[PDB]
Specification:
Elements (H helix, E strand, L loop, with lengths): L15 E7 L2 E7 L1 H9 L5 H4 L6 E3 L4 E2 L2 H8 L4 H10 L2 E3 L2 H21 L12 H10 L10 H15 L6 E8 L3 H12 L1 E7 L5 E8 L3 H12 L4 E4 L13
Antiparallel strand pairs: 1-2, 1-5, 3-4, 6-8, 6-9, 7-8
Helix pairs in contact: 5-6, 5-7, 8-9
Subunit structure: Associates with the 60S ribosomal subunit. Interacts with NPM1, RPA1 and PRKDC. May interact with NIP7. Found in a complex consisting of the 60S ribosomal subunit, SBDS and EFL1. Interacts with EFL1. Interacts with CLN3.
Keywords: Acetylation, Cytoplasm, Cytoskeleton, Disease variant, Nucleus, Ribosome biogenesis
Organism: Homo sapiens (Human)
Length: 250
């Protein structure tokens, strides 16, 4: 009984176990910590993957399964799968420190990337560093929501960050017209530099390509572009950072 050895009676996988209290009785299900967290967060996940065990258990730690009768008398349905989803969204998932640390580092890294690659600061539009955004986030006692989407957290972080460092997001479209020859040097440069869209070139003629970049990459762009064009090509602006996305004056 005791001891628990995966080489005699039961193996007991290391799957994620979620528990939920309802009707007085406690239920548990074997699911994936990654699929469960992403599912509850609001990600269209499949039960065939998030649920390792398509059956409402009771004592997964020991290997005790529930009953269909009690399942319907406790939740009002026999669909063990449905009940599992409920516990996955309402119940609590049991994960080790590693499972929590891994998700934290990943989430933190993403936020720092989007803020460092898709955001600037009120200082000569100098792109901030991931280490800078991370430090400030921690210094301001900021706790990421691993049980939610990063996008939604962007507002909370970008707003709170204002206290330490004013961080804002801004996009912009670029348009460059290079000659026949000079166009061969610029194009190859813009390609890797950033997203290249609306590219039109003629046989032994000038090429007209537009470059899309945030309010941080614009620096490296204008730099390399100007140095690559050498007052030989033309550059027109497409979009401009202006408050006209959702609200104009309200």
């Amino acid at each position: 009984m005791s001891i628990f050895t995966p080489t005699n009676q039961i193996r007991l996988t290391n799957v994620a176990v979620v528990r939920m209290k309802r009707a007085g009785k406690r239920f548990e299900i074997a699911c994936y910590k990654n699929k469960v967290v992403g599912w509850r967060s609001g990600v269209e996940k499949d039960l065939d993957e998030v649920l390792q065990t398509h059956s409402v258990f009771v004592n997964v730690s020991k290997g005790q399964v529930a009953k269909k009768e009690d399942l319907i008398s406790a939740f009002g349905t026999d669909d063990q799968t449905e009940i599992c989803k409920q516990i996955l969204t309402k119940g609590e998932v049991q994960v080790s420190d590693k499972e929590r640390h891994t998700q934290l580092e990943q989430m933190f890294r993403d936020i720092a990337t989007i803020v460092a690659d898709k955001c600037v600061n009120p200082e000569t539009k100098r792109p901030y560093t991931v280490i800078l955004i991370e430090r400030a986030m921690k210094d301001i006692h900021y706790s990421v929501k691993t049980n939610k989407s990063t996008k939604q957290q962007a507002l909370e972080v970008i707003k709170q960050l204002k206290e330490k460092m004013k961080i804002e997001r801004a996009h912009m479209r670029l348009r460059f017209i290079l000659p026949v020859n000079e166009g061969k040097k610029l194009k190859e440069k813009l390609k890797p530099l950033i997203k290249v869209i609306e590219s039109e070139d003629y046989g032994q003629q000038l090429e007209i390509v537009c470059l899309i970049d945030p309010g941080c990459f614009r620096e490296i762009d204008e730099l390399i572009k100007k140095e690559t064009k050498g007052k030989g090509s033309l550059e027109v602006l497409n979009l401009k950072d202006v408050e006209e996305g959702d609200e104009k004056f309200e």
